[PDB]
């Protein structure tokens, strides 16, 4: 049961809470980092105060803030949300929200993946088609089947290799 208490808070791998450089020498980054920061800061300070042998009242104060800081990271807003001081009073996304989405959920939704050999277009009736056929614009067929196409191109005296075939199609 002890395990419900934390004495080591884990840290999400940085690559998926990244620190991208965007346009204008400005940066984009996940809220987690800013949640993680302030937690580290309070822990480190707590170490100092304890090392100093500070009065237990100012230590309590620290421990209180630390507990809160951990709360704010794991599941922010189950005790009066923290926000980025400037920007706006937009509450920071915690792990819990990042997992499930804050919208009650996990429905609602926000649920679906994008897909690699796909396309969309306006449809028109094909009275000529037999029941198992459909009409595909070649322009669209050529992209959807590009990798397959490139190989046939190589199997035929119409391209030396694949790079040159791909270049043919750009």
């Amino acid at each position: 049961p002890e395990w419900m208490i934390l004495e080591a808070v884990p840290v999400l791998p940085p690559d998926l809470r990244p620190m991208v450089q965007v346009d204008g020498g400005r940066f984009a980054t996940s809220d987690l980092n800013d949640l993680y920061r302030r937690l580290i800061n309070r822990n480190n300070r707590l170490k100092k105060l304890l090392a100093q042998g500070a009065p237990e009242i100012i230590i309590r104060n620290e421990k209180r803030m630390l507990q809160e800081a951990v709360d704010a990271l794991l599941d922010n807003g189950r005790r009066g949300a923290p926000v980025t001081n400037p920007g706006s009073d937009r509450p920071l996304r915690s792990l819990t929200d990042i997992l499930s989405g804050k919208q009650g959920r996990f429905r609602q939704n926000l649920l679906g993946k994008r897909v690699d050999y796909s396309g969309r277009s306006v449809i028109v009736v094909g009275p000529q088609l037999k029941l198992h056929q459909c009409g595909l614009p070649k322009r669209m067929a050529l992209e959807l089947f590009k990798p397959f196409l490139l190989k046939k191109m190589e199997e035929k005296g119409i391209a030396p290799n694949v790079k040159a075939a791909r270049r043919m199609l750009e």
């Binding site: 209180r64 809160e68 005790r79 009066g80």
Partner: peptide, 13 residues
Amino acid sequence: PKISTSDPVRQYL
């Protein structure tokens, strides 16, 4: 029962 939620500062004072 969400009474003593946002004490922090009041608390420390």
